[PDB]
Design a protein around this ligand. Structure first.
Ligand code: ATP
Ligand code: MG
Ligand code: MG
Length: 152
RNA sequence: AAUGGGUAAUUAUAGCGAGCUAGAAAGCCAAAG
């Protein structure tokens, strides 16, 4: 639905996607990772340079956090005698792994010629032109290892 | 002095030993629906 079409359509709950404005809808703020720099079928012909030097290919990356449930569930018990194995640490860890992959991934794909098809929980699936997809995951992890101090 | 004979050495030497351009394209399919 569009913005002003909320006057027209009858609903019960409205979900708003990748937004922080208050607005008049009093909606529910979901966070779906999404980006398109172009259509999917143009990413092969976008792999050229300004010279013409590039192979007409498109790359696809599927990222995955390693041992995510093993770091969610147990996670913190290594430091101390176990005095950091609480709900609020894992609830903050719950946000910080969703705040990364569902919001911050569009900043990493700001001007890259790609399309994040899905990013959620641990998993990313992002088609795109091959120079940028290779540059995406190098730029994603080098951010994600600074986000987590090298762990996860 | 005549006369009988040739004898030894070298058997190639110094280099280059490949260079550059192309390294899969276009259809089917998928897209556009
Ligand atoms: N957003 C999330 N936050 C915390 N845990 C998650 C999230 N999404 C999935 N999981 C966890 O991931 C587990 C499934 O394993 P998954 O492959 O998804 O990641 P993993 O546990 O790190 O394993 P792997 O190393 O194979 O990726 C589930 O037990 C679930 O609890
Ligand atoms: Mg996982
Ligand atoms: Mg997983």
């Amino acid at each position: 639905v569009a913005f002003e079409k909320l006057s027209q359509e009858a609903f019960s709950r409205v979900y708003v996607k990748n937004d922080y404005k208050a607005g008049t809808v009093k909606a529910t703020h979901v966070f779906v990772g999404d980006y398109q720099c172009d259509e999917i079928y143009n990413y092969a012909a976008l792999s050229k340079n300004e010279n013409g030097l590039g192979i007409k290919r498109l790359a696809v990356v599927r990222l995955d956090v390693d041992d995510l449930g093993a770091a969610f569930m147990a996670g913190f018990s290594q430091q101390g005698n176990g005095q950091y194995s609480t709900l609020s640490r894992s609830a903050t860890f719950s946000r910080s792994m969703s705040l990364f992959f569902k919001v911050y991934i569009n900043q990493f794909a700001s001007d890259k010629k790609l399309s994040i098809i899905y990013a959620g929980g641990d998993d990313v699936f992002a088609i795109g032109s091959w120079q940028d997809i290779i540059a995406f995951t190098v730029e994603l992890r080098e951010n994600f290892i600074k986000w987590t101090n090298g762990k996860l």
